[PDB]
Amino acid sequence: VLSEGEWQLVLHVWAKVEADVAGHGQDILIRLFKSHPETLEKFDRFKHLKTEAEMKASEDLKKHGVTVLTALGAILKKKGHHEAELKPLAQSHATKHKIPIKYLEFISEAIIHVLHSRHPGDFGADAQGAMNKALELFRKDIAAKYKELGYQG
Numbered sequence: 099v100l101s102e103g104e105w106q107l108v109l110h111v112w113a114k115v116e117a118d119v120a121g122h123g124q125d126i127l128i129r130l131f132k133s134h135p136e137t138l139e140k141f142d143r144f145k146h147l148k149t150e151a152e153m154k155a156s157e158d159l160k161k162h163g164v165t166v167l168t169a170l171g172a173i174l175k176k177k178g179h180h181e182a183e184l185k186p187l188a189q190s191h192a193t194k195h196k197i198p199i200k201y202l203e204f205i206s207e208a209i210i211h212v213l214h215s216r217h218p219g220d221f222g223a224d225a226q227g228a229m230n231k232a233l234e235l236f237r238k239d240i241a242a243k244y245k246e247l248g249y250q251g
């Protein structure tokens with residue numbers, strides 16, 4: 099479980115992400131798609147996008163970025179009491195979208211890269227540590243629902 103202090107480090111930097119949800123969402127998805135191109139192939143909506151410049155220009159991608167970060171934010175702010183929010187997400191991602199747990203690890207790494215670029219002063223090693231723990235908790239709870247439903251390990 100995270101401590102109350104580790105949750106404070108997480109939510110202090112998240113309040114900053116919330117000053118520019120759309121800009122953050124874009125940087126994260128682009129980083130994901132460039133670092134792990136197989137992830138782009140899950141999105142019928144985006145797989146036409148070939149270059150970073152085309153990605154940066156897509157308003158539809160920006161929109162999805164806001165969807166992703168807004169769902170994540172609502173989970174983080176529950177501080178691990180996140181059952182009601184996480185269950186519908188794991189169900190759709192397991193059964194409808196077919197998203198391997200490994201890809202959740204990839205987008206975790208993208209989130210932490212981007213936070214580090216935009217918010218150095220609020221994202222030191224102790225914050226990076228807390229954020230890593232929070233994302234692991236997110237993954238571990240998703241993985242439990244995946245196993246229940248019979249989805250890939």
Ligand code: HEM
Pocket residue numbers: 137138140141142143165166167169170186187190191195197201202205
């Ligand atoms: C922090 C991780 C993520 C969060 C919070 C998240 C959240 C969401 C939300 C809220 C939606 C819309 C409602 C629904 O379908 O459940 C969605 C849709 C989707 N997500 Fe995720 N997602 C995450 C990770 C991923 C990753 C890693 C991928 C793919 C590699 C993925 C692929 C998709 C696809 C294919 C859709 C449908 C988009 C569309 O075609 O409209 N998601 N996600």
